[PDB]
Amino acid sequence: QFAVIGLGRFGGSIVKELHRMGHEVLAVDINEEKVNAYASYATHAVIANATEENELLSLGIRNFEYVIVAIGANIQASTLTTLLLKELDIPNIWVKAQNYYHHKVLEKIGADRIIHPEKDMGVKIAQSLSDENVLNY
Amino acid sequence: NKQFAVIGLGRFGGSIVKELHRMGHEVLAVDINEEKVNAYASYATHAVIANATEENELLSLGIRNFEYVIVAIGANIQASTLTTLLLKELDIPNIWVKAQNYYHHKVLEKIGADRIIHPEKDMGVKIAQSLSDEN
Amino acid sequence: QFAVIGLGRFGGSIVKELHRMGHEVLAVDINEEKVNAYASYATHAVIANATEENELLSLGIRNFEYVIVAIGANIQASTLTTLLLKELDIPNIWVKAQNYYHHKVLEKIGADRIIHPEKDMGVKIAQSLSDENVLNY
Amino acid sequence: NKQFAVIGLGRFGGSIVKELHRMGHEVLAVDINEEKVNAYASYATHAVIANATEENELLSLGIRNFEYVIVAIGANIQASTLTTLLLKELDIPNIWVKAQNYYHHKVLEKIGADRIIHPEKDMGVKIAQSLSDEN
Amino acid sequence: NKQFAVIGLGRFGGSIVKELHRMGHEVLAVDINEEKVNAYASYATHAVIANATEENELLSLGIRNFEYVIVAIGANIQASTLTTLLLKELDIPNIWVKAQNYYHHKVLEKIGADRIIHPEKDMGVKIAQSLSDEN
Amino acid sequence: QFAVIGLGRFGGSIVKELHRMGHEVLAVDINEEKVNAYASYATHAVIANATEENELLSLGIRNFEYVIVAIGANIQASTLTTLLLKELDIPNIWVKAQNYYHHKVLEKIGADRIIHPEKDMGVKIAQSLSDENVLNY
Amino acid sequence: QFAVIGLGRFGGSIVKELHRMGHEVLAVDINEEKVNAYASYATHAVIANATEENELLSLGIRNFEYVIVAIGANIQASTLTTLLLKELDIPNIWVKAQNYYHHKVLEKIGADRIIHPEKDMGVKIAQSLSDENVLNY
Amino acid sequence: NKQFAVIGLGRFGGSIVKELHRMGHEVLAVDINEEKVNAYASYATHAVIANATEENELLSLGIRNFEYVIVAIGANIQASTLTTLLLKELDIPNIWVKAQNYYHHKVLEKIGADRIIHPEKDMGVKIAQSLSDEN
Ligand SMILES: Nc1ncnc2c1ncn2[C@@H]1O[C@H](COP(=O)(O)OP(=O)(O)OP(=O)(O)O)[C@@H](O)[C@H]1O
Ligand SMILES: Nc1ncnc2c1ncn2[C@@H]1O[C@H](COP(=O)(O)OP(=O)(O)OP(=O)(O)O)[C@@H](O)[C@H]1O
Ligand SMILES: Nc1ncnc2c1ncn2[C@@H]1O[C@H](COP(=O)(O)OP(=O)(O)OP(=O)(O)O)[C@@H](O)[C@H]1O
Numbered sequence A, C, F, G: 001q002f003a004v005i006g007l008g009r010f011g012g013s014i015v016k017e018l019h020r021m022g023h024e025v026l027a028v029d030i031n032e033e034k035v036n037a038y039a040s041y042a043t044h045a046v047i048a049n050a051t052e053e054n055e056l057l058s059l060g061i062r063n064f065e066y067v068i069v070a071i072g073a074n075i076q077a078s079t080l081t082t083l084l085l086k087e088l089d090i091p092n093i094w095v096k097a098q099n100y101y102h103h104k105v106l107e108k109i110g111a112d113r114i115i116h117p118e119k120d121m122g123v124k125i126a127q128s129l130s131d132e133n134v135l136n137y
Numbered sequence B, D, E, H: 001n002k003q004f005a006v007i008g009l010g011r012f013g014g015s016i017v018k019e020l021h022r023m024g025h026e027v028l029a030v031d032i033n034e035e036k037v038n039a040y041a042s043y044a045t046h047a048v049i050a051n052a053t054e055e056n057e058l059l060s061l062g063i064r065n066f067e068y069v070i071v072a073i074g075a076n077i078q079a080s081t082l083t084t085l086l087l088k089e090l091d092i093p094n095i096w097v098k099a100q101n102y103y104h105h106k107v108l109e110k111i112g113a114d115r116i117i118h119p120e121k122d123m124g125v126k127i128a129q130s131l132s133d134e135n
């Protein structure tokens, strides 16, 4: 149903919520320590290298409607993965962007949603502030 | 008038000044670095240059007249907390602060911050919510 | 009676004198090597993370009239600890300040005495020099 | 007159120049770095710029006419000891020096320093003493 | 006319601009760094200064009118790929790109690059071939 | 027949092709991990320090018509080796040059061919581009 | 007869020559690997910390007419040692100077000869050049 | 006249230019860095600024007219050896070079240097000799 690649503060944090709301989630990450840390939250916590076109097939990643690339300080895999996923014809692929340049490649690459955790949170914050006063509550 | 004041114009803080603007709201944006100030002068009702930690400059901005102040200082937990701690002094109704890490979050909870934001984590839970709603 | 958190040149050095003058002292420090180094001087040398609200309770730290935060190059714990201690309603809390900014947070935080080992020693030195000539000895 | 001379205006050395001043005492403060010199010109009876290690500049300041000289050089054990060693030459009655570490302390004891100060440790024993007196 | 365009004038890219010149061919050489541009102005039919990643500057050079574009960006896989990805947009017939490492090579294969060059390896196989022919 | 010293992207890559074309090759390199990595491609993959005048003799390096110094970020051994080889009266010695200065010493030293993987590839690239249009294919 | 403290290129190199000319030498150095490396050249190769006033006594260092402080990139021990030795009333103490400042402390400290391996070698070189032509040989 | 030429004015090389001077000998001192050149202009019969590796500048100094050239280049084995290798070309009678390490020494032996100097070691054997003579 929902696959999340890269378990950092952003990616992991989304695996939990997905769990808390009673949803099955496949969480993956080359680093095994990161995998064990969420084994209790994901319907399945696998260890793999998302960039490896084969391991991706090991996870039947092509059977998920949504995959979330949460790779962080690695514009390399973040981009390679998104590309690979784009081949498996994965319906919706959402990716975290590390910087501006990244956002651009991601757009053209074919990502369905780009997330800028920092900025995006900003908009949501201004939005929250706005509600507090407009709706008045 | 004088409802939102944003201190620290980084990717997070600045990004909220624009949105505040785009939604037709007046915003006071501040930041010691003048280059950062000029960069948002077009978005804020007022873009001032100042050192938030300086108890006097803070008074120069009538910061006590704002219902909401947002401390978006980043890689300088030092100022971030002093500011917040100063803001607390002026009895500023609502003060929201970005937390740099776990400790920072812990202090802010005891310092007296009204809302702590973890852009990274908090947005994560945000996306979980969206995938959930999409299906 | 007297609790000292952080056994560096400053903090430790005070544990000894407290000892030498026949006083019971509780010396604590996450780093165990630092703890063993003063085990012979303190009435009790515990290993703990002062920032951990629970471990602090493990030491009955709330039963001391004086606690000394001697944390050094860690404006983080130095500040968190002082805060935690300020909650346990610890009567007198003396803290070493790392820099100016630190001194300010400490003041507002609620510390009862801030120590600037470098500067403070200066005043004591000028004072000593002064005595040598004024009292004339 | 000409009783205290302080070489090296860092947090330690400078801090003692002010106190000397506050207590109404004349002080000669010196330091190669001119920015440090201007910073205390208001506190010292005389704020000179010089290289303490230079056996001649030392003579430019009549440093031999002071009963007390305080070497507050910090992260430069090199100068700190040469200075002290030069001061010893001029037969300066009392020379107190800040020690950077254990070795420095050891040399100073053999160099001929009259008093070695370990701001960190020495203040520690100072605080032990105060807690003791408070109870 | 308008047959070869080389983006990025480093040891690899520049070295190909000269040869193109030496063999009596017109070449458009480009590079954000102006010092690099002046260095080959003597070799290229046109040495422009620009940011290849900027979708507009690319249009300033009529880059879409070239049969061959060579991305010789080096230690900046970031631009190297964005450029290539932009070039792909303009439907540039043949785009050859230098690969910085294994990943870069992999993306370029999926990005749509027509030829990936690994100066180090590729030249190795080149020398193997020469020893072979010498004997 | 063909000896290759230094198995980096350049040097190794040439050992393979030499293999693929059915040629016997002696590949050497101090680092054993690099040696094992090509043991399957070379008629012989030895571990040695090319700069050691003795080890060089251990490999009968004087019995090869061609030796290729592919040492990379080590202008030291690259140069020492070429010198040593130049003593063994090795017929043809081809060396990879790290920078310009290196190229100059190599020329004067007595190297028979200097390779600038980066630049040389450039010329071959311009050449290829040229063929595509002149020969028209 | 001759004691040498610090076995670096300079210090060690002098232990050998002392040996080669049939002289007994005591070579010392905290680092044991350096000590083993000259055990075959010195009448005695001890491991110790020259700055330790006690270990120095362990070597009866006060029984030598000449001690050579060859400590290098350690203006600390080089100076402390020379001081300690100066207390044991060691007749002649020769020290390698690391920089100018060092040379000055050494002079005042009381060293009998300061050596600037770099510069001193220079004078000897100019001297050699001079002989080649003046004496004409 | 034209008997000694010293290339590279560092602690070693420069130190030999002075001594050559003090003993009343003419010396040509050279070094790319002009500040180093001015520093010894008072000691050398001629203090030129040049790049020893440049086969032409070397000719600008008539370096081929000197019986002895001393390469005192230090932390740049690159130039040190190229120079020496160039000097060899001009058939310079005697060329003495400072060796930076073991390798450098090995190449110089094969390059054709007439004398290799290891300031550190060589002086060590020098001191051994003096202690020996003192007793
Ligand atoms: N090729 C890969 N395949 C799968 N997972 C990967 C791959 N490369 C890196 N990761 C994982 O993705 C994450 C890297 O992103 P990053 O380093 O930014 O996380 P972080 O810095 O620790 O926390 P944050 O994402 O909030 O900055 C790590 O959890 C890492 O283990
Ligand atoms: N004492 C202060 N008073 C007011 N503004 C400050 C103060 N200190 C820093 N700032 C400003 O607030 C921001 C600090 O947060 P931060 O350092 O993380 O920004 P950044 O690192 O440049 O970019 P980012 O926020 O995305 O990490 C900077 O824009 C800085 O100019
Ligand atoms: N969270 C913590 N809880 C308890 N003790 C801590 C904690 N964090 C650090 N310490 C201790 O406090 C000390 C850190 O301060 P610091 O590093 O400045 O000491 P130092 O640098 O070695 O000597 P000095 O204090 O004189 O500069 C260490 O002894 C460390 O083990």
Ligand SMILES: Nc1ncnc2c1ncn2[C@@H]1O[C@H](COP(=O)(O)OP(=O)(O)OP(=O)(O)O)[C@@H](O)[C@H]1O
Pocket (backbone or CB within 6 Å): C118, D007, D008, D009, D010, D011, D012, D030, D031, D032, D033, D036, D050, D051, D052, D053, D072, D073, D074, D075, D076, D079
């Ligand atoms: N040779 C010298 N003669 C006179 N003054 C000197 C000399 N060398 C350094 N100083 C001065 O004395 C001080 C050296 O001590 P130090 O380097 O520790 O000061 P600091 O590091 O800038 O601040 P702090 O003393 O708190 O560490 C500096 O203020 C420096 O300008």
Ligand SMILES: Nc1ncnc2c1ncn2[C@@H]1O[C@H](COP(=O)(O)OP(=O)(O)OP(=O)(O)O)[C@@H](O)[C@H]1O
Pocket (backbone or CB within 6 Å): E007, E008, E009, E010, E011, E012, E030, E031, E032, E033, E036, E050, E051, E052, E053, E072, E073, E074, E075, E076, E079, F118
């Ligand atoms: N966005 C860009 N648009 C156009 N040219 C660029 C861009 N980014 C970098 N360049 C240029 O292309 C080259 C980048 O490749 P690279 O960084 O490897 O050159 P280099 O490191 O200076 O030397 P070398 O190519 O031999 O490693 C540089 O010459 C740089 O000036």
Ligand SMILES: Nc1ncnc2c1ncn2[C@@H]1O[C@H](COP(=O)(O)OP(=O)(O)OP(=O)(O)O)[C@@H](O)[C@H]1O
Pocket (backbone or CB within 6 Å): E120, F005, F006, F007, F008, F009, F010, F011, F028, F029, F030, F031, F034, F048, F049, F050, F051, F070, F071, F072, F073, F074, F077
């Ligand atoms: N003295 C030596 N004798 C034999 N082989 C050596 C010697 N010194 C280094 N090598 C080998 O030569 C190579 C060093 O060149 P280099 O470091 O540039 O290779 P690389 O950087 O890993 O890849 P590339 O050559 O494409 O840059 C290594 O494979 C190393 O093990």
Ligand SMILES: Nc1ncnc2c1ncn2[C@@H]1O[C@H](COP(=O)(O)OP(=O)(O)OP(=O)(O)O)[C@@H](O)[C@H]1O
Pocket (backbone or CB within 6 Å): G005, G006, G007, G008, G009, G010, G011, G028, G029, G030, G031, G034, G048, G049, G050, G051, G070, G071, G072, G073, G074, G077, H120
């Ligand atoms: N306290 C000490 N007591 C005795 N020997 C010491 C002491 N401290 C350092 N040494 C020795 O003295 C030497 C340090 O000088 P140094 O580091 O300059 O030698 P090096 O750099 O390896 O070679 P070179 O002296 O030619 O520069 C080492 O051999 C070290 O083991």
Ligand SMILES: Nc1ncnc2c1ncn2[C@@H]1O[C@H](COP(=O)(O)OP(=O)(O)OP(=O)(O)O)[C@@H](O)[C@H]1O
Pocket (backbone or CB within 6 Å): G118, H007, H008, H009, H010, H011, H012, H030, H031, H032, H033, H036, H050, H051, H052, H053, H072, H073, H074, H075, H076, H079
């Ligand atoms: N190609 C060159 N031609 C002529 N002179 C050069 C060349 N390269 C460097 N030099 C000079 O020769 C010297 C190089 O030796 P080195 O770098 O060791 O001097 P240093 O490091 O500044 O001081 P020291 O010699 O004591 O280590 C420098 O003074 C430098 O200016």
